[PDB]
Design a protein around this ligand. Structure first.
Ligand SMILES: Nc1ncnc2c1ncn2[C@@H]1O[C@H](COP(=O)(O)OP(=O)(O)OC[C@H]2O[C@@H](O)[C@H](O)[C@@H]2O)[C@@H](O)[C@H]1O
Ligand SMILES: Nc1ncnc2c1ncn2[C@@H]1O[C@H](COP(=O)(O)OP(=O)(O)OC[C@H]2O[C@@H](O)[C@H](O)[C@@H]2O)[C@@H](O)[C@H]1O
Ligand SMILES: [Fe+3]
Ligand SMILES: [Fe+3]
Lengths: 383, 385
């Protein structure tokens, strides 16, 4: 049988954060810890939530120490702030970095034997649900509001480790494109291709089944249709991206992804590369590598990305799906080569070993060898 | 709010053998004793034993309430609540179709919200302060999607009416969608519960509150159901597993946005005659679709397309007629009677049925604003040739 973990409650649309104060009142919670970063406080994004909490008389504390590719240090600092604050629930405001930090804090607070954070890696054997999390994404996006995964950076061991745990699912998600409109175009582009990567890798993952296939192919259609308009600043395209990135998460959380994520994680660990940029550069090369192992699915992908696939042979339709991703990356201004974003050729053997050992790689429809992964990094390195 | 809410199961298991996941879910949640809410047919047919045998093997305690009747009454809710309170159970397992699942939601809500002990005070947006007793839902029809909806429907025998209780607090904690639990449905019950599911998906697709996510879920559910129902009625194993998924996907949508006049007109037939819900919906659906057609934009082109009609280069009027005809054809193909007279409706009751339908909460979702005279005419149209 196939398991689905989803949000029990979710609010969608511009103004959806307007639902938070009534959700808190209905749940009887006494005090939030907001987990966020300094950029989102400075840009006034956090105030969009705290102004409503203030007007409704709801108590909150804040931890704004989250860094991109959140570290064990940030988790431990946020956990201390949470424990000392007296808060009884968490509000995650931000992209994947604050939402993943928030999941680690909520889990460890109720499962204190995992206080080293490292011990959460893999299928975390936690006995107790997380502290309740209300999740408010500000990128479009990682779908962290609806996934059971989170990824933490171990600075000492220079590795990003994946933690998978039904106990971390947020109780409520608020998916509000008003919270996302302030993303710089380059961040809309990178987080949008992260979402496309989730949906493509989820569509072709070893564990795919009928329900996740339906969610993923819908997400690919929405994202491919909206991302150029959203990067260009179109309001409705931003709202479409907010939904598509979430629909991708409903699928991939429950079945897996593949070698794009497996190869992106070590780049985050080694170089602090933005996750979406790493995914965007790798995606078309890993798609080419996987192509023979994907049945008719690249015909579906090419079709919903706007390619006329009718009358193409399968090999041609597979090429067309790969070309459609290269084209989108060019159109939204993501650099095409890993050398452009600070990767070193010398590190590829170490990166490849880390990718081979990453949780995500096992979902890949083609079984990757160490030398296959080394070769893929080199293919993505330069023209 | 401009914003749209979705309530879903936090956890669900899908596929043949999904009930195999129940004992580990119970152990992980630390529950001490189930009350199984079901009916005598499901006990006698061995369906409940598919679950209790696994619970016995895992050493998990249970008691059973098997008093549920189709179109469950205030009496059945009150009796089941007493059995729950007296059993020392700390969670509920709903095994059955909509009747046991709706009874179980009422029991779970009242147990933790005792001020609603009269049951009829739950009608509408139930102002409950406490979540339901945890419910693990195991559908045996395909189906009402009661395992994933926030609605439940109880019969007030005294006032001769079905009333709808809508409450996020009633959502089951886990659903187990296992076509092995559904295979014993008689072909006629597969037909009626299958077209109930189609009605959920079609009404949800065109309901006033429809938006992008529910549209995506509903049109996928219509495709799965229209593709699988004839095969499932014929006894095909894989079609039964497809129906089990399709009926659930319909519920993910309609729970969150609404349905329309088909359900509005079906509830009074249930109240007046104890008409099976799916048969009532099946007979009414094509007539209400025709009534609604001018208020549905391009959506009947989408419905006709996924019901296997060649809609390419059809005008909108032709496509709308084709969607209605596809539903009439499916109803004929799976053996549902075409006329209300055939299933025990009286012409003399149509004025009272129409007022009950006009007042039914479901009717408010209808994309065309129905008048009393429109509903009287729709009952007469569905009555006979
Ligand atoms: N709406 C916004 N407006 C402006 N800046 C924003 C906004 N949202 C986020 N930012 C900024 O963008 C930067 C990247 O934020 P992240 O949370 O790191 O971005 P995201 O791609 O959502 O998350 C990536 C993280 O999630 C994991 O899936 C992945 O492995 C990685 O750790 C930060 O400086 C953050 O403040
Ligand atoms: N797998 C099965 N095998 C055999 N008989 C079955 C099975 N499942 C159900 N039945 C029998 O089918 C009959 C109808 O069961 P219901 O639970 O009433 O049917 P269903 O259509 O699922 O639910 C209808 C109810 O739900 C509400 O949405 C609606 O308003 C109505 O009250 C009962 O006699 C029941 O025992
Ligand atoms: Fe990602
Ligand atoms: Fe129904």
């Amino acid at each position: 049988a196939n398991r689905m973990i989803l949000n029990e409650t979710a609010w969608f649309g511009r103004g959806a954060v307007g639902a938070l104060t009534d959700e808190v009142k209905r749940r009887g919670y006494q005090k939030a810890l907001i987990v966020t970063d300094k950029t989102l406080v400075q840009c006034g994004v956090v105030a969009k939530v705290t102004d409503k909490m203030d007007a409704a008389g709801l108590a909150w504390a804040i931890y704004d120490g989250v860094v991109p590719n959140p570290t064990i240090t940030v988790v431990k600092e946020g956990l201390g702030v949470f424990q000392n604050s007296g808060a009884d629930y968490l509000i995650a405001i931000g992209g994947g970095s604050p939402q993943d930090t928030c999941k680690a804090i909520g889990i460890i607070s109720n499962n204190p034997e995992f206080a080293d954070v490292r011990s959460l890696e893999g299928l975390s054997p936690t006995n107790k649900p997380s502290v309740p999390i209300l999740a408010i994404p500000t990128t479009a996006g990682t779908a962290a509001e609806v996934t059971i995964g989170y990824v933490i950076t171990d600075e000492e061991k220079r590795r990003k480790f994946v933690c998978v745990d039904p106990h971390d699912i947020p109780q409520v998600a608020f998916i509000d494109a008003d919270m996302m409109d302030g993303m710089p175009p380059a961040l809309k582009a990178a987080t949008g291709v992260d979402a496309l990567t989730h949906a493509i890798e989820g569509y072709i993952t070893r564990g795919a089944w009928a329900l996740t296939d339906a969610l993923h192919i819908k997400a690919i259609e929405i994202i491919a249709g909206a991302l150029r308009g959203s990067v260009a600043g179109d309001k409705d395209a931003g709202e479409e991206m907010a939904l598509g990135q979430y629909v991708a998460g409903m699928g991939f959380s429950n079945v897996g992804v593949g070698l794009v994520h497996g190869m992106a994680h070590p780049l985050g660990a080694f170089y602090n590369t933005p996750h979406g940029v790493a995914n965007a550069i790798l995606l078309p090369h890993v798609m080419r590598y996987n192509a023979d192992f994907t049945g008719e699915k690249y015909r579906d992908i090419a079709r919903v990305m706007g390619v006329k696939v009718e009358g193409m042979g399968l090999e041609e339709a597979r090429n067309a799906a790969v070309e459609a991703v290269f084209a989108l990356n060019r159109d939204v201004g993501i650099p095409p080569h890993l050398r452009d974003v600070g990767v070193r050729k010398e590190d590829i053997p170490a990166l490849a070993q880390a990718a081979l050992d990453d949780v995500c790689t096992g979902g890949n429809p083609r079984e990757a060898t160490l030398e296959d992964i080394v070769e893929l990094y080199h293919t993505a390195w330069t023209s």
